[PDB]
Amino acid sequence: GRLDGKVIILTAAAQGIGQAAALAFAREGAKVIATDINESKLQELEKYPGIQTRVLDVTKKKQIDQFANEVERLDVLFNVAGFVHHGTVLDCEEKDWDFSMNLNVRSMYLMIKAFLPKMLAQKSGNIINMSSVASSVKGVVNRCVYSTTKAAVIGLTKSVAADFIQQGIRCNCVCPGTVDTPSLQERIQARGNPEEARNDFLKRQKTGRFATAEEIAMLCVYLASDESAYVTGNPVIIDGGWSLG
Amino acid sequence: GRLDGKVIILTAAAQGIGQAAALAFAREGAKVIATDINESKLQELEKYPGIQTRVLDVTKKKQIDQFANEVERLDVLFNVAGFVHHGTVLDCEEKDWDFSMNLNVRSMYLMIKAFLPKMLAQKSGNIINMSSVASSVKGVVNRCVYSTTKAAVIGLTKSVAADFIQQGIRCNCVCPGTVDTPSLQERIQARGNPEEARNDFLKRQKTGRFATAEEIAMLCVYLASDESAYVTGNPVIIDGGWSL
Amino acid sequence: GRLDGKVIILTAAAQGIGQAAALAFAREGAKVIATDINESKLQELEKYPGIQTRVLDVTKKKQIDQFANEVERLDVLFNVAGFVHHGTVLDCEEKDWDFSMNLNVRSMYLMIKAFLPKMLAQKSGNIINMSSVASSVKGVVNRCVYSTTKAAVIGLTKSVAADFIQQGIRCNCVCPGTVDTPSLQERIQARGNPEEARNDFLKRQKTGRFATAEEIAMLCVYLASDESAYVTGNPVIIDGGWSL
Amino acid sequence: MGRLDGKVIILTAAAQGIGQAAALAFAREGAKVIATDINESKLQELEKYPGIQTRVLDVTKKKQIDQFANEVERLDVLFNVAGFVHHGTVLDCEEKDWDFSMNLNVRSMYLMIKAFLPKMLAQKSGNIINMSSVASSVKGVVNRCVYSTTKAAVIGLTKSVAADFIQQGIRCNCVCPGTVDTPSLQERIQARGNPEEARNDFLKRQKTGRFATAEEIAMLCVYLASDESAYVTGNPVIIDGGWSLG
Numbered sequence: 006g007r008l009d010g011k012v013i014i015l016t017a018a019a020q021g022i023g024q025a026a027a028l029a030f031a032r033e034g035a036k037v038i039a040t041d042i043n044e045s046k047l048q049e050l051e052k053y054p055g056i057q058t059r060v061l062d063v064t065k066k067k068q069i070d071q072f073a074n075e076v077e078r079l080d081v082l083f084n085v086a087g088f089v090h091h092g093t094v095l096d097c098e099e100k101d102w103d104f105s106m107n108l109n110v111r112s113m114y115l116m117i118k119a120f121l122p123k124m125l126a127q128k129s130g131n132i133i134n135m136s137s138v139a140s141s142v143k144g145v146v147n148r149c150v151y152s153t154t155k156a157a158v159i160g161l162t163k164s165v166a167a168d169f170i171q172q173g174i175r176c177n178c179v180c181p182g183t184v185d186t187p188s189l190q191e192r193i194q195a196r197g198n199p200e201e202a203r204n205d206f207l208k209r210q211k212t213g214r215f216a217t218a219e220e221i222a223m224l225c226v227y228l229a230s231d232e233s234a235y236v237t238g239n240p241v242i243i244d245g246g247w248s249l250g
Numbered sequence: 251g252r253l254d255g256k257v258i259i260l261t262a263a264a265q266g267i268g269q270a271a272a273l274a275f276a277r278e279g280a281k282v283i284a285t286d287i288n289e290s291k292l293q294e295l296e297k298y299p300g301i302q303t304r305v306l307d308v309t310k311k312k313q314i315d316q317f318a319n320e321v322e323r324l325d326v327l328f329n330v331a332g333f334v335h336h337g338t339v340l341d342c343e344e345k346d347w348d349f350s351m352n353l354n355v356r357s358m359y360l361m362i363k364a365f366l367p368k369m370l371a372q373k374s375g376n377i378i379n380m381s382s383v384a385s386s387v388k389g390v391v392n393r394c395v396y397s398t399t400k401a402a403v404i405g406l407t408k409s410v411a412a413d414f415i416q417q418g419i420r421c422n423c424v425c426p427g428t429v430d431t432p433s434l435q436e437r438i439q440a441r442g443n444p445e446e447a448r449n450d451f452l453k454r455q456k457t458g459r460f461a462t463a464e465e466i467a468m469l470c471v472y473l474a475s476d477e478s479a480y481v482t483g484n485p486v487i488i489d490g491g492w493s494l
Numbered sequence: 495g496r497l498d499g500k501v502i503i504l505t506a507a508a509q510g511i512g513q514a515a516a517l518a519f520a521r522e523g524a525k526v527i528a529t530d531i532n533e534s535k536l537q538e539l540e541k542y543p544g545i546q547t548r549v550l551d552v553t554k555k556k557q558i559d560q561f562a563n564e565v566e567r568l569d570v571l572f573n574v575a576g577f578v579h580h581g582t583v584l585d586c587e588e589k590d591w592d593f594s595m596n597l598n599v600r601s602m603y604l605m606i607k608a609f610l611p612k613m614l615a616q617k618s619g620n621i622i623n624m625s626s627v628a629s630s631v632k633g634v635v636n637r638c639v640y641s642t643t644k645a646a647v648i649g650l651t652k653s654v655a656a657d658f659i660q661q662g663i664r665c666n667c668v669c670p671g672t673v674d675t676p677s678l679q680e681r682i683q684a685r686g687n688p689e690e691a692r693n694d695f696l697k698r699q700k701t702g703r704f705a706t707a708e709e710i711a712m713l714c715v716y717l718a719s720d721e722s723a724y725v726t727g728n729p730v731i732i733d734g735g736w737s738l
Numbered sequence: 739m740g741r742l743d744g745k746v747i748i749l750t751a752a753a754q755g756i757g758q759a760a761a762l763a764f765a766r767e768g769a770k771v772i773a774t775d776i777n778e779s780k781l782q783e784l785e786k787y788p789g790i791q792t793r794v795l796d797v798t799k800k801k802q803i804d805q806f807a808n809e810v811e812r813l814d815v816l817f818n819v820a821g822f823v824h825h826g827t828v829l830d831c832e833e834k835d836w837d838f839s840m841n842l843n844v845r846s847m848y849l850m851i852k853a854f855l856p857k858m859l860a861q862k863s864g865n866i867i868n869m870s871s872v873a874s875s876v877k878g879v880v881n882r883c884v885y886s887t888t889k890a891a892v893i894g895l896t897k898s899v900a901a902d903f904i905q906q907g908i909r910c911n912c913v914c915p916g917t918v919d920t921p922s923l924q925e926r927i928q929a930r931g932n933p934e935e936a937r938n939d940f941l942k943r944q945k946t947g948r949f950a951t952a953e954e955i956a957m958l959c960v961y962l963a964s965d966e967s968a969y970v971t972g973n974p975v976i977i978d979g980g981w982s983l984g
């Protein structure tokens with residue numbers, strides 16, 4: 006397996022990209038600690054060899070620190086947790102702004118701050134953060150606070166990469182286009198005409214399809230593996246040509 | 251003047267880049283409304299033709315909304331306010347993280363959401379945001395929360411530019427290298443050996459100097475003027491070759 | 495004027511962006527040496543205070559070297575010459591590939607290598623190169639060799655900027671979206687349905703217009719001026735939200 | 739089952755360095771590899787490896803290229819590897835240096851793509867990987883004028899092909915390394931006045947205190963060549979050990 010010997014911790018693992026990653030990591034021989042707030046859905050992964058699960062709300066610092074004190078070592082941290090708000094800056098009220106900033110960015114700060122010292126004591130570690138093309142990468146309509154947080158993810162990634170490169174740490178982030186996940190389906194259904202919302206989303210995608218969560222996972226495998234040891238400080242795009250032009 | 255007939259509001263105007271921008275706008279014929287929390291320093295600008303002042307804390311939504319209700323129209327909003335925390339992710343306590351996120355990003359969100367509707371009703375407007383090369387542009391050491399916020403600023407910029415391009419709104423951000431401002435001097439002094447600190451900052455700068463606030467201001471003039479009408483959604487770098 | 499005391503040499507000056515640049519530089523007090531292969535059109539600029547003209551084919555090293563020897567000093571070199579080939583990689587025959595590489599890229603290399611030593615001896619110089627968003631910035635349809643060359647331009651820009659920063663040289667390039675020039679009109683007319691071709695080009699442009707050459711010129715004035723001394727190594731976008 | 743099972747892959751400059759490592763890596767992942775180079779005796783060493791067939795090919799010769807293409811029934815992937823690294827500023831670069839690099843580093847790719855793309859279009863499926871560098875439009879690097887210009891041009895060419903042929907099932911990406919320990923890198927070190935010291939300037943780029951191996955570059959090429967990366971197109975993928983980071 007491409008990840009033999011690796012201990013990997015991830016968040017938001019119960020469905021979507023996190024689930025697919027958890028499964029993909031485990032199949033490649035990793036020791037996976039898969040976390041989510043949704044305990045009943047999460048515990049489904051316990052049936053898969055190589056995966057152990059734990060309930061974790063990434064907005065709760067007390068929860069995070071206690072979890073960190075339980076973990077002996079890790080090789081990889083994959084911060085997946087994030088919410089996609091629909092709206093422009095005018096559509097974003099204070100509670101939407103804060104909710105996204107807390108879940109999407111503060112979460113990563115708290116996870117990295119709890120887990121990075123373990124990596125530093127072993128002079129080795131790898132941190133993968135979930136960003137988006139809707140970010141500093143490009144402008145995307147109706148995604149104000151999302152794009153703002155997802156840009157923030159890139160800043161945080163490059164910061165960590167620069168600060169700890171000489172202590173054996175790498176840090177990268179993943180920037181997908183549209184991925185067929187349960188939340189995407191929720192966002193389609195939430196529209197006034199879902200039949201039509203599905204077509205706006207496909208418009209971005211000149212190949213005529215969304216990415217699968219598995220495809221996103223296989224990039225995370227590459228970035229988790231020693232194959233990519235020489236890759237750090239990058240937003241890796243996986244967008245089906247959306248940001249291309 | 252290159253900014254004649256323009257009504258420009260800007261924050262953090264009492265010193266540094268804000269101050270230089272205020273004075274540069276005014277010299278180019280703008281009607282400037284220059285805001286800061288520091289009332290005594292801010293009110294020095296009152297002596298300059300074209301500048302009117304108002305005390306404003308950009309972290310206070312209530313103050314922001316009241317200010318907006320006072321303003322009949324604008325052409326340009328320049329979000330300048332921001333703090334530079336020194337440290338890695340490990341040096342950043344929750345208080346540091348939240349203070350920076352509130353002043354550096356939330357501020358912009360609240361200012362934009364208050365003033366943008368004005369611009370939309372006139373089908374015209376221009377929002378300039380202060381970012382930095384310490385951001386999504388490149389990795390800079392001991393600047394964790396700062397870089398995170400300044401990246402957020404680029405995301406917010408591109409978002410606003412994308413959402414309101416068809417309603418005559420432009421949005422760009424400015425990404426300096428090291429600029430000789432009073433806060434920069436504070437950061438130098440704050441280190442263990444301020445001699446040595448000054449040389450680390452210069453190491454960034456292969457031209458052997460920092461930028462002046464007036465130089466940053468002249469970029470802001472270009473971006474504020476109709477000369478740059480066709481420029482939107484960009485992080486404009488002004489870094490003396492640092493990110494090169 | 496904003497360019498008072500600057501000696502500025504430019505290519506492809508007889509029409510389009512070059513022409514607008516020349517007139518804009520002259521209006522701001524520059525001493526302009528405007529060059530082009532089209533002698534009769536070029537000579538029109540002679541009537542404008544501050545512009546002297548010289549015929550120059552930028553694909554002819556021997557002409558370039560002899561021109562350089564005529565020139566005592568410069569402050570700015572503006573490489574404007576470039577041709578826009580229509581087609582994919584499959585539409586591009588060896589003749590199209592080579593013609594574009596030589597005019598669009600080799601030209602810049604020859605002008606730079608002939609004029610840069612002057613700037614090095616003054617310990618001061620500024621090189622502006624015309625790029626495009628159709629380049630390494632973004633992928634654009636039916637622009638294969640063009641995009642290849644305009645990418646090459648960014649490479650060359652950043653090279654020169656990195657190599658000569660400590661000797662007082664700056665180098666940047668300009669990356670437009672669609673600009674309403676005579677060659678753009680020629681490209682429109684050259685299509686099967688020019689009525690419909692005008693609309694494809696417009697679809698690029700969410701503000702519903704092309705840039706004017708004057709607008710591109712004003713970016714060039716900013717980049718040519720000492721106002722922008724701290725700006726080097728950048729591809730400056732001016733695209734009306736196309737790459738956004 | 740290898741990650742490249744069923745894939746027919748053609749590459750250039752396969753006899754040493756990145757190209758060699760890639761050929762070997764593609765073959766071990768179950769690709770059918772057609773490995774080409776100008777250096778016949780060295781290239782022929784790869785014939786002992788299961789899955790690799792070799793052919794002499796000078797990528798500056800249009801006539802050679804078209805005849806080779808006429809020999810190939812199908813391909814899934816084209817990896818354009820050939821490129822020379824000139825040492826010097828714009829001032830150090832004479833007409834012959836400029837032209838030599840432009841023809842090998844860029845014209846070569848144009849000709850290979852123009853010969854092979856029609857095959858991929860006819861199958862409504864193809865993947866083109868181009869070798870670029872961080873010394874390019876990505877960042878400014880000293881003493882690399884014509885190299886950086888060509889490797890920028892590669893990125894422009896990559897995005898053009900990706901934009902033009904996306905709807906016909908074609909992907910195009912490029913790879914942008916920092917310093918890779920290859921034989922030509924060793925040549926460039928040895929060619930300096932003090933090779934001990936050239937070696938340390940190259941290491942200065944590299945905050946991790948090492949160069950990449952050709953193998954490491956290869957494994958990125960495996961990912962980009964595989965269907966795992968089917969949703970990746972139009973990108974310069976950086977693999978630079980933090981060099982462009984800051």
Ligand SMILES: NC(=O)c1ccc[n+]([C@@H]2O[C@H](COP(=O)([O-])OP(=O)(O)OC[C@H]3O[C@@H](n4cnc5c(N)ncnc54)[C@H](O)[C@@H]3O)[C@@H](O)[C@H]2O)c1
Pocket residue numbers: 016017018019020021022023040041042043061062063064085086087088089108135136137138180181182183184185186187188189218
């Ligand atoms: N799906 C896409 O089109 C797409 C595109 C780009 C980026 N992303 C990013 O990928 C990541 C995952 O999204 P997805 O769509 O694959 O999954 P999703 O949105 O379908 O699932 C989210 C998961 O996160 C969990 N979660 C919610 N709040 C949490 C909290 N406080 N703590 C811990 N877990 C929590 C949920 O229980 C759920 O299992 C997000 O960061 C998202 O921004 C998604």
Ligand SMILES: NC(=O)c1ccc[n+]([C@@H]2O[C@H](COP(=O)([O-])OP(=O)(O)OC[C@H]3O[C@@H](n4cnc5c(N)ncnc54)[C@H](O)[C@@H]3O)[C@@H](O)[C@H]2O)c1
Pocket residue numbers: 261262263264265266267268285286287288306307308309330331332333334353380381382383425426427428429430431432433434463
């Ligand atoms: N090297 C540099 O100085 C540099 C480089 C890149 C970007 N920047 C950015 O430029 C912007 C201005 O920084 P500067 O160093 O020119 O000025 P500075 O930091 O010296 O001045 C900051 C000003 O902001 C005001 N201020 C502080 N909190 C406020 C609040 N809550 N509400 C309203 N005003 C408040 C202060 O009273 C002061 O007048 C910042 O966003 C900074 O991040 C500076």
Ligand SMILES: NC(=O)c1ccc[n+]([C@@H]2O[C@H](COP(=O)([O-])OP(=O)(O)OC[C@H]3O[C@@H](n4cnc5c(N)ncnc54)[C@H](O)[C@@H]3O)[C@@H](O)[C@H]2O)c1
Pocket residue numbers: 505506507508509510511512529530531532550551552553574575576577578597624625626627669670671672673674675676677678707
């Ligand atoms: N027009 C646009 O939409 C647009 C967009 C992006 C970039 N550009 C770039 O701007 C530059 C100028 O294009 P434009 O469209 O403004 O002008 P244009 O194409 O209308 O005019 C070109 C000028 O170049 C001159 N010229 C041609 N060959 C020459 C040679 N060998 N030596 C010297 N001069 C020569 C011509 O005589 C003419 O006066 C080009 O590099 C072009 O790629 C144009």
Ligand SMILES: NC(=O)c1ccc[n+]([C@@H]2O[C@H](COP(=O)([O-])OP(=O)(O)OC[C@H]3O[C@@H](n4cnc5c(N)ncnc54)[C@H](O)[C@@H]3O)[C@@H](O)[C@H]2O)c1
Pocket residue numbers: 750751752753754755756757774775776777795796797798819820821822823842869870871872914915916917918919920921922923952
């Ligand atoms: N530090 C690095 O080594 C580094 C970094 C970034 C990018 N690259 C790129 O990787 C590619 C390979 O370089 P490398 O250093 O791994 O290998 P190399 O330079 O050691 O070997 C080059 C190979 O190309 C072959 N070759 C030369 N001319 C040819 C021609 N006309 N036709 C066909 N083959 C020809 C040679 O015989 C040799 O086998 C180049 O494009 C280079 O620019 C290398």
